[PDB]
């Protein structure tokens, strides 16, 4: 009665404030800069080791070893340069949605329909990779987990909540309960102080790690969000939804800047990543291929069609050399 | 030229041979998604199988290794995880026949059934359909008329006509009848008939998949 009307008045207040600060769109600004979008990138490596669809992959900071998790119960850690499968971790529950690679390189994470984040210590004195920790505090399936450190990990599950965990303790320290829909993706700022989460309410919420309270909320999409990715500055992030439109959001401005949408594609974005500088935005579609948008001018520049099925995940290396796209055809192809 | 990473490539081919063996072992065993609108009806049949997230139930019947995947305990948005089960063999859709009395649940089961049948991922998946609580349904027919949940239906309060009408209404829901065939079975007290029907249905779906691969169908 009164409280819902107060919420509507506060939402109209923040919408009017972020409309009043919006005076010149970025498309008006970007007409002066030189369009250097048009590129061609051939596939250099085709990582053939999976017998089922690859749901996720992540890149190490050294940018040679990349984890890759598929439905055959296998989390294969590949060597990118020499095409060598370094590790092949067997999975207790083969139904995975995600995987992560620690910044130190010591640990990997994994999770899926078993709603349990399993963390695997790689560098051990025995030969085999053992289950380091087994985090069981979520009700819904995990969708994206990311290592802050070797000791802390964030997760985002289908029980509407995200969770900061301490790994050696084994229990969730911070719980993030702002979303109303199922949280599909996480991405961390490069200082690892704050992150953003895209959920199925078409709302990307910026959380801070230390405090544990929702700082910002970005509600610009019509359909549910599948992919989120920070800008290399850390002051912006792109958002890929099923509405065929991936749109950049500015944190300091606190609304949309621009939308990357083409007319002929009605397909959905599954994976969003940025290059090292951030001039071009990678975007994996379920049109069985991937696109490369000029992230300042919104012109579809590159087309990466080497995949026989929809690309689930893609990752850009930390040094920015290559971009590896893992699809449902059980192939992870390293474009460059 | 390769100095000591020849041994790393030997490691890659060794674990790759282990991946090939694990993939053949996992493709050996048949996978069965187990859906339903109520937990008790699915619990009744999964307690009749041979001796927190998804619940994997690995058993074996007539040298055929089944993996039931009960997901209905997990409560989340179904469209985001449903595409995990694209390469599944069969969906055992369980539904209790006494659900129409309480609250409307039969229409919820119809909506869930229409959603899984007209899902774009299960265009090839020929599904099994269990109609649970047969004795309880006989008692509900003896006590209550069936015309409450079906306004269109007009008929006698007998088990033989009403159960066949419910089976026909469930079988009528799929738009695509060419590819997938909705096998249907009434749940009995004996576990032998249920496991035998699952074996016969999955055997027919395996033979249809093999002839789809060979190219006769």
């Amino acid at each position, epitope marked *: 009665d009164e409280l819902r009307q107060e919420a509507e008045q506060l939402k109209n207040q923040i919408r009017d404030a972020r409309k009043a600060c919006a005076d010149a769109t970025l498309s008006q600004i970007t007409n002066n800069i030189d369009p250097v979008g048009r590129i061609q990138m051939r596939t250099r490596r085709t990582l053939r080791g999976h017998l089922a669809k690859i749901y996720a992959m992540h890149w190490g900071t050294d940018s040679r070893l990349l984890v890759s998790a598929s439905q055959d119960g296998k989390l294969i850690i590949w060597d990118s340069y020499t095409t060598n499968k370094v590790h092949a971790i067997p999975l207790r529950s083969s139904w995975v949605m995600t995987c992560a690679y620690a910044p130190s390189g010591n640990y990997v994470a994994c999770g899926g329909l078993d709603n349990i984040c399993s963390i695997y210590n790689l560098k051990t004195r025995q030969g085999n990779v053992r289950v380091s920790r087994e985090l069981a505090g979520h009700t819904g399936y995990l969708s994206c987990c990311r290592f802050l450190d070797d000791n802390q990990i964030v997760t985002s599950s289908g029980d509407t909540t995200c969770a900061l965990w301490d790994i050696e303790t084994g229990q969730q320290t911070t719980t993030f309960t702002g979303h109303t829909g199922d949280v599909m993706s996480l991405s961390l700022a490069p200082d690892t102080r704050l992150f953003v989460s895209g959920a199925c309410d078409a709302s990307a919420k910026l959380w801070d790690v230390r405090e544990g309270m929702c700082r910002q909320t970005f509600t610009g999409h019509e359909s549910d969000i599948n992919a989120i990715c920070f800008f290399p500055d850390g002051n912006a992030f792109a958002t890929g939804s099923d509405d065929a439109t991936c749109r950049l959001f500015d944190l300091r401005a606190d609304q949309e800047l621009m939308t990357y949408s083409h007319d002929n594609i009605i397909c959905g974005i599954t994976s969003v990543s940025f290059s090292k500088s951030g001039r071009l935005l990678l975007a994996g579609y379920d049109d069985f291929n991937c696109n490369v948008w000029d992230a300042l001018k919104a012109d579809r520049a590159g087309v990466l069609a080497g995949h026989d099925n929809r690309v689930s995940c893609l990752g850009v290396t930390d040094d920015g050399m290559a971009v590896a796209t893992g699809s449902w055809d059980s192939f992870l192809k390293i474009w460059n | *030229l390769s100095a*000591e*990473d020849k*041994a790393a490539v030997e490691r890659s081919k060794m674990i790759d041979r282990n991946l090939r063996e694990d993939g053949e072992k996992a493709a050996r065993e048949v996978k069965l998604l187990l859906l339903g609108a109520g937990e008790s009806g699915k619990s009744t049949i999964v307690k009749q199988m041979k001796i927190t997230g998804i619940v994997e139930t690995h058993f074996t019947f007539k040298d055929l290794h089944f993996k039931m995947f009960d997901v209905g305990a997990q409560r989340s948005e179904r469209k985001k995880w449903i595409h995990c089960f694209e390469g599944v063999t069969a969906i055992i859709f369980c539904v209790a026949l006494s659900d129409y009395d309480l609250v409307n649940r039969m229409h919820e089961s119809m909506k869930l059934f229409d959603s899984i049948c007209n899902n774009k991922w299960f265009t090839d998946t020929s599904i099994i359909l269990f109609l649970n609580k047969k004795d309880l349904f006989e008692e509900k027919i003896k006590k209550s008329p069936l015309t409450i949940c079906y306004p269109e239906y007009a008929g006698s309060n007998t088990y033989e006509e009403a159960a066949a009408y419910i089976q026909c209404q469930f079988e009528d829901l799929n738009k695509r009848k060419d590819t997938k065939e909705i096998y249907t079975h009434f749940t009995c007290s004996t576990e032998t008939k249920n496991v035998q029907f699952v074996f016969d249905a999955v055997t027919d779906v395996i033979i249809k998949n093999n002839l789809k691969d060979c190219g006769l169908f």
Partner: single-chain antibody
Amino acid sequence: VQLVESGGGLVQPGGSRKLSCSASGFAFSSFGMHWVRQAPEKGLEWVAYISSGSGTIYYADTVKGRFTISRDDPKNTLFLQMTSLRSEDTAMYYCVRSIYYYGSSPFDFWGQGTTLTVSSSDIVMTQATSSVPVTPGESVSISCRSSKSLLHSNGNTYLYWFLQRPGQSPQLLIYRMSNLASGVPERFSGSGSGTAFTLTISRLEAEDVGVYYCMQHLEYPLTFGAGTKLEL
């Protein structure tokens, strides 16, 4: 982790002998296995190798034919069958564990060794220094001259520093000259350019007193150094 050798003792020259390396406490089938001999008051020397999964066997050029190495994976035991034993084979035989992938630290854990007394084109690793007495608490520099340029085309220069203590088995000190092994203190710097290699110890301790072995891992056969002994 535990590697226990068995089968040593006094062997008549020309006789046959089987050595059993019982492995315990690690995934044995995923480790390549080495034998490394050490003659009394002489440097280390490689003998033989089996790749993980019994795929690619190797032997030293000077002992080829007489030694037959085999691996038993369910029982987790490395067998070394020996025939036509000469007077040169009286040595301590170490059963060495190694693993080969990107970022792996091979030659990490060494067996205790077995004493076997017999009655009666290679990359030369010039260890020019024999012994230097150094007072503890001082920075120590050990040089290593190699005959072939160990800098491979892929980038990682293959050279392993080992420390052997008096009365103890040798252990991996540094692998690939820029990477410390798991469990070594943070005092061992490696610096290598082309064929010149340098080990730097910032603070010398009583545990660091021993013989340093410079071993190249570019081509088979694997060649060790003569050794650099320290005396406190």
